[PDB]
């Protein structure tokens, strides 16, 4: 749901910020969150800086509009959606939040969280629901 997904995004972002020494104060569900957290770490374990070019293409500032974020994220889905690419999506948002804080734009993290929820509900849920819903995600990554 719009609320379920919003909560999922905030949890993942908060988890990543915490894990990396940053503040998260700027902000079965438990089974999905845990699975996503682990999926994100697993991926980052293999690719330490896989979104350098992507975040660079966006060069986010308080003046960045959603449409720009959307256009860049669309890059991850050039061949459509799959679970791994959804994990990349979450990981990408986490990296954007980290970068925002490093640039003293911590005000943007809640905004990125909002953009992610919107993008999730709009472009990824259609595929997620068609392929088993989050229960399938848990079944594959849990």
UniProtKB/Swiss-Prot annotation:
Short sequence motif named BH4, residue ranges: 4-24
Organism placement in taxonomy: Eukaryota, Metazoa, Chordata, Craniata, Vertebrata
Protein name: Bcl-2-like protein 1
Motif window: BH1: 75-94
Motif segment (BH2): 126-141
Functional summary from the UniProt entry: Potent inhibitor of cell death. Inhibits activation of caspases. Appears to regulate cell death by blocking the voltage-dependent anion channel (VDAC) by binding to it and preventing the release of the caspase activator, CYC1, from the mitochondrial membrane. Also acts as a regulator of G2 checkpoint and progression to cytokinesis during mitosis. Isoform Bcl-X(L) also regulates presynaptic plasticity, including neurotransmitter release and recovery, number of axonal mitochondria as well as size and number of synaptic vesicle clusters. During synaptic stimulation, increases ATP availability from mitochondria through regulation of mitochondrial membrane ATP synthase F(1)F(0) activity and regulates endocytic vesicle retrieval in hippocampal neurons through association with DMN1L and stimulation of its GTPase activity in synaptic vesicles.
Full-sequence range covered: 1 to 196 of 233
Annotated tissue distribution: Bcl-X(S) is expressed at high levels in cells that undergo a high rate of turnover, such as developing lymphocytes. In contrast, Bcl-X(L) is found in tissues containing long-lived postmitotic cells, such as adult brain.
Record keywords: Apoptosis, Cytoplasm, Cytoplasmic vesicle, Cytoskeleton, Endocytosis, Membrane, Mitochondrion, Mitochondrion inner membrane, Mitochondrion outer membrane, Nucleus, Phosphoprotein, Synapse, Transmembrane, Transmembrane helix, Ubl conjugation
């Amino acid at each position: 749901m719009s609320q379920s997904n919003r909560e999922l995004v905030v949890d993942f972002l908060s988890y990543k910020l915490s894990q990396k020494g940053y503040s998260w104060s700027q902000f079965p569900m438990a089974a999905v969150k845990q699975a996503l957290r682990e999926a994100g770490d697993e991926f980052e374990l293999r690719y330490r800086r896989a979104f350098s070019d992507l975040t660079s293409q966006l060069h986010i500032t308080p003046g960045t509009a959603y449409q720009s974020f959307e256009q860049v994220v669309n890059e991850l889905f050039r061949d459509g959606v799959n679970w791994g690419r959804i994990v990349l999506f979450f990981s990408f948002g986490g990296a954007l939040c980290v970068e925002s804080v490093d640039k003293e734009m911590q005000v943007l993290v809640s905004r990125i969280a909002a953009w992610m929820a919107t993008y999730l509900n709009d472009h990824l849920e259609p595929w997620i629901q068609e392929n088993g819903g989050w229960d399938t995600f848990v079944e594959l990554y849990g």
